[PDB]
């Protein structure tokens, strides 16, 4: 599909199957892309997985997952907020479905446009660039491998 990176480079990538958009110290964003027709280099998103890693005192680990024809307004455990009932550092709201991870100044918008899924991520620069050496495959940071474009 089309990708707009944290570095404002716009790319058209095949990236068929499961691929990490974000893989850092605070968040995992994983997508599944499918060829629009068999054998096509044009691919589109049918699954969006977001892992909000446990942040002690703010949120327990939460997983959000949307698929084509299933965009819930809750995490996989049926919750709409991280941690306790009083803890609102992590929440989900329906409109787009939106995830507000205030604790990491991060917003994630997910919607279904036709048969496929779209994604928008707003993240603070210091947190977006906070990842270990081995976390070198992140479509949002470095874009796609040259062979995928």
């Amino acid at each position: 599909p089309h990708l707009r990176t944290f570095k404002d480079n716009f790319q058209t990538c095949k990236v068929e199957g499961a691929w990490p958009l974000i893989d850092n110290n605070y968040l995992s964003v994983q997508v599944t892309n499918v060829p629009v027709v068999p054998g096509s280099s044009a691919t589109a998103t049918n699954k969006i997985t977001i892992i909000f890693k446990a942040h002690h005192g703010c949120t327990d680990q939460k997983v959000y997952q949307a698929v084509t024809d299933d965009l819930p307004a809750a995490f996989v455990d049926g919750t709409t907020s991280g941690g306790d009932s009083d803890a609102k550092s992590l929440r989900i709201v329906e409109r787009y479905v939106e995830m507000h991870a205030r604790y990491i100044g991060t917003t994630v918008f997910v919607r279904q446009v036709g048969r496929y899924l779209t994604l928008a991520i707003r993240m603070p620069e210091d947190l977006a660039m906070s990842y270990e050496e081995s976390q070198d495959l992140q479509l949002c940071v470095n874009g796609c491998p040259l062979s995928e474009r």
């Binding site: 707009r4 589109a44 205030r102 100044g105 036709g114 496929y116 707003r122 620069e125």
Partner: peptide, 16 residues
Amino acid sequence: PCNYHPSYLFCGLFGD
């Protein structure tokens, strides 16, 4: 207290 302490980076993935 949990709330993040200033510039934002944006990422997008969409269809074709």
